[PDB]
């Protein structure tokens, strides 16, 4: 019902959602906060998701419009613009879209233009969540609001592992959203397999959550769910290196007063030096490796109707 | 919604049909709350306290996959019998407990959700949970808050129960605008005691006054639940200094123990019930009759004014 | 559609939200609560005035003998100034009962938002929204206000939260929740008697055309919220920076001395600074109104204009 001046759904995923085909939304924030490993990194995971007999939909803003699903020109734009482009969450939104910019959306945002657009499934590498000091600085990502209240599946890696897990996992109880373990009790750490802390639910498999997904919402609670999907054991970082490094950057960002937005970018980016560019990889293999569940996901749903 | 995901027993569907007033129970003070056969017959009397004040009882919970308003009493002991075996139920966990055909014992959020879904604005307790003792470090808070924000019920309750952080939950309670009423109190019930250093929002008199603040607040389109805090009745309260003491071991043992999660309420008032040799268990019952029978009031007085 | 016995809105307001005319909303509580007799009903006939001067339609909101009023009279503006603190200060929790016994109060932001939502008005000016309190990561004291801006479409005009609040928690709270904060021409978050801090605002926009801009988009994609927009005080009027400071550090502490706590707390501290500063605080309190008034006309033209 919405304005085409505000949103445009592209020819193949409008097509995609006319014959009722599998489609999997994507965010773009992941791919401006490295070239060329940006946009090239980009263009594969929708590649990944078309090879597993679903469709692809990177969501971003360009010239003020929400596009759902994007054009090679368009994911190229986005990651050699780099940081010049707006990171985007809800409280973004409205301004970047009045003002005709291009911006990069979070997992928060993906998620409210998926709905708009009648996308049920999400993948992504990590979701945001509660920071480390939080219980201080009340440092919470709105991701965690949207995941409360808008009707969608993130398929990730658990939340990014240089937030703070436990107090993330009482948040998601909380707002009421499910937090699944895919073939796992352990709640997958990012980078790591596992966490000291568990999930809320175990499913063993794709149809089980699209099954699930199907009650969620004829019964009528709103909001997401959280599938993590722990990363593959070849692709894991080593427990004490990976976390000796978060722990550093973590350390630096407070004695250099990073706050607000550019925690996050800020973070990762050092973590990708202190491990030489090690942390990346492994990011990269996750998203794969969660675009590939979040397919299955999507077409058992698709069956469920 | 469908009768494969929902169903309202004929006592219960009577009921609404011919606008008599309902009141809502939960089903995990039936299973997780209380021991067998004090869980099962309680839950029987505590629906037959509802009846003799004249109004009418659903207990709310999942029965092999389907979310129940009102229960048989083969049901209800099923509940009793299982009990821990049974999952503890609240808003995240519904959808995989229906899904999957299993039983459920349901939380004050997850029934407020299904009462709603019938259209029931009544609901007896115990007690809600809240914030928990050490939440400003742990971010440890009740799914039941959120209920409340966004889900039009009334809880009738002896206020939060009393293992948790009552000052914390009062401020919670404000930020997210549910008033938290009490009824013929000023100071805050603290579940097996009568009073608490802390204040509900307001205190209102007569179930009468109740219901017509539930058609105005939800007539003005502010949605959400509302707390009735009922002091438990004089001869059942547990003293002051005696309850306390077994609830600052119990946590301070939870603590220790590493407890966490949906299994903290549960632990902490067997715990509880032990180191009182079962007086905390007979406070909690009469509380419960005592909510029941406020409950039934004020479903009458909202159902004279709603249908 | 609200029932008649609930919701009145003046015929002055209901003719120009007809006739498409640009209308901006004012609160109560800086009435009755937020300041001293007379220069509170004086400060509040006042502002009526500059929003007409600025071309649009003042709406003053507050609960008058259990009816929600939208646009009030020089009488009843000035009943709530002199019954002052005899007023209810009504919150969302507050609203139902105030509305339901008949009586009057004075609406905080969260229940100005909620009423003018209802009559239909974007735009709402006030001196400054409540916020997360100081020591909140322990009390979770954090006003409804926040909350209300969170789910409710109103774009509400202010010289930031007040600088009583702890202004950092609060910028956090802000975008956990989705709100945008923009600051009028201003990169820095002002703090209510003083010009700047050092916070920052989500975005800074230039112009009243941006902003409305900014709403018609964010409401037409369907993002439920309210904005806020933080517009600082004019140099003139400002506070000095260490004066100031030092008179609201001392009322927190005295605050928490005497254990003040909840919805008492923002005007106790606010009558304990203007104490402190000669009632110096108070007269930059009066102007930053004024200058917010105007700002909020220009924002309800523009829209209107658009919208
Ligand atoms: C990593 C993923 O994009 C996630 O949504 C963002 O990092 C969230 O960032 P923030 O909005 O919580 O800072
Ligand atoms: C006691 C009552 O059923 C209440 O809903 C539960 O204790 C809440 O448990 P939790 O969901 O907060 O763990
Ligand atoms: C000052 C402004 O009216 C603000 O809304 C109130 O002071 C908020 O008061 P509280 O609800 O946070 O106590
Ligand atoms: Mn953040
Ligand atoms: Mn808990
Ligand atoms: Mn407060």
Redesign the interface.
């Given at each position: 019902k919405?304005?085409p001046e505000?949103?445009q759904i592209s020819p193949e995923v409008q097509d995609a959602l006319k014959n009722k085909k599998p489609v999997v939304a994507l965010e773009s924030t992941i791919i401006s906060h490295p070239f060329p490993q940006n946009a090239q990194t980009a263009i594969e995971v929708e590649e990944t998701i078309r090879k597993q007999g679903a469709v692809p939909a990177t969501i971003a803003i360009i010239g003020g419009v929400?596009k759902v699903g994007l054009s090679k020109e368009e994911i190229e734009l986005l990651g050699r613009e780099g940081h010049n482009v707006t990171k985007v969450?809800?409280?973004?939104?409205?301004?970047v879209?009045?003002?005709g910019k291009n911006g990069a959306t979070t997992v928060?945002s993906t998620m409210?233009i998926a709905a708009?657009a009648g996308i049920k499934v999400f993948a992504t590498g990590g979701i945001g969540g509660?920071h480390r000091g939080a219980?201080?600085?009340?440092?919470?990502?709105?991701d965690?609001?949207?995941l409360?209240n808008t009707n969608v599946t993130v398929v990730c890696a658990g939340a990014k592992s240089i937030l703070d897990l436990?107090?993330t996992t009482?948040?998601?109880?909380?707002?009421?959203?499910?937090?699944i373990g895919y073939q796992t009790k352990a709640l997958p750490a990012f980078f790591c397999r596992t966490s000291p802390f568990?999930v809320?639910?175990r499913?063993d498999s794709a149809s089980?959550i699209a099954?699930?997904?199907?009650?969620?919402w004829?019964?009528?609670?709103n909001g997401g769910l959280v599938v993590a999907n722990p990363i593959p054991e070849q692709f894991a970082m080593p427990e004490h290196t990976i976390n000796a490094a978060i722990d550093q950057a973590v350390a630096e960002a407070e004695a250099q007063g990073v706050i607000?937005?550019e925690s996050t970018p800020f973070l990762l980016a050092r973590v990708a030096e202190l491990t030489g560019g090690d942390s990346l990889k492994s990011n990269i293999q996750l998203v794969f490796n969660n675009a590939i569940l979040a397919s299955e996901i999507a077409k058992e749903y698709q069956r469920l109707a």
């Open positions: 919405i304005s505000l949103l929400m969450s809800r409280r973004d939104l409205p301004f879209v009045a003002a928060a409210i708009l509660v219980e201080h600085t009340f440092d919470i990502s709105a965690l609001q949207e409360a436990g107090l009482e948040y998601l109880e909380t707002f009421g959203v499910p937090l568990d809320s639910i499913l089980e099954r699930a997904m199907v009650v969620k004829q019964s009528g609670l607000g937005k």
